[PDB]
Subunit: 105 residues, 5 copies
């Protein structure tokens, strides 16, 4: 597939909606790293993703639990998710950075 | 191969059974991360998966050992398991979250 | 796609694990995923080794992971495939140490 | 596809440009690890990559947050990016090292 | 699918590792999996580097991992493939540091 860089920043009041325009193209979001930004203090941060499960209902899943003094970056190794996907902070002020690839076949 | 989002929550008194209707061989659970929940205490948490070995018997294996002050998240990198699978906390009260993909072959 | 079965074992000082497959027409691989310390392990260094054949036709020993409860209780290997036979053991530390992975069989 | 080793060192005010090559081959940069170098201090380091998004515009993303006393190395597992790519330290003085593979389809 | 053999080496301030082959280098890949501090390693910074050919055809040195016993004694590289010849060495620290991985061989 074609491969484009993806990223976003999450905050307590800022989520991210990944949606792709309808067309003759199949899209995947492949998540790589979740990293705490400066401004996360030392509070617990939990990042969640919401998208469709196999049985056709939205589910919310926890991608990572981070804390600056313990584990500031988690590497997901290319966690692919079919859009639409919402990414949000379940707790923590943020910022939390997300990186990955937007794959198009 | 279609790809759907998967996750579950585990607690001391709550496991998770991943099962599929008919063609178990066309389905794979691909585990990504095991994460401690908000509200988990700082005790040792150990997560276990139970599924079939080649010899045809269920076996119990340890997926991850976590502790809030040391390692609150473990990334498994797409550990595929053929259903049925049971996921449970062997140790700790949780909540512990698991995320991954439910992959379906065509 | 190969068939995929679950694999795991527990290691202790003086308790290793021999993974071997019976003869057949198929190709087998052991794909190692995680190494994790178990409850009650001493908070000391644990070193896990794997033994299997090298390219030159001799069994060799390699270190898969170094773990310690208060620092790094789990290491994820990401699917380290090894052709059987494989012997897994603790080179040091009390254990218990758990290993998980997949037994892949291509027909 | 041919496989070549790639690496760079980043510092404050010292970034890296992985440039479109002057050939008609297909190229990918696949990032493997980001690691703090000797002499890096214990401040937060944030490493960023800039490259083209799906819509055609350049974007800046965070690859890793590192701190010597907590997490001196992050493994990305083969994060492929299409050139051109700029790698830089957003925060921290470094040195920070990046390693990976230059993949070429000829 | 390539033949898949086990690979490992030990590094020390004392000792590096040269991975080389006598036949066609392009049929071989070293796929690195883990870098781990050994028993006997102290708590100083350890930095492991690899040296191998870049696209332009000259040798380049890269850092594979930075380890410290009290912080991060093992780094998993997830199958970092390199074409021989390759040299692995400690740039910093006295070790021992162990490396494990796969030696992959293309079948003609
Ligand atoms: Co919203
Ligand atoms: Co049950
Ligand atoms: Co034995
Ligand atoms: Co510049
Ligand atoms: Co030498």
């Amino acid at each position: 597939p074609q491969n484009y860089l993806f990223g976003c920043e999450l905050k307590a009041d800022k989520d991210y909606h990944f949606k792709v325009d309808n067309d003759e193209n199949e899209h995947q979001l492949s998540l790589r790293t979740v990293s705490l930004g400066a401004g996360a203090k030392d509070e617990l941060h939990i990042v969640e993703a919401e998208a469709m499960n196999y049985e056709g209902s939205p589910i919310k899943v926890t991608l990572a639990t981070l804390k600056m003094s313990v584990q500031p970056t988690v590497s997901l190794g290319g966690f692919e998710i079919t859009p639409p996907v919402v990414l949000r902070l379940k707790c923590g002020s943020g910022p939390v950075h997300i990186s990955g690839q937007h794959l198009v076949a």
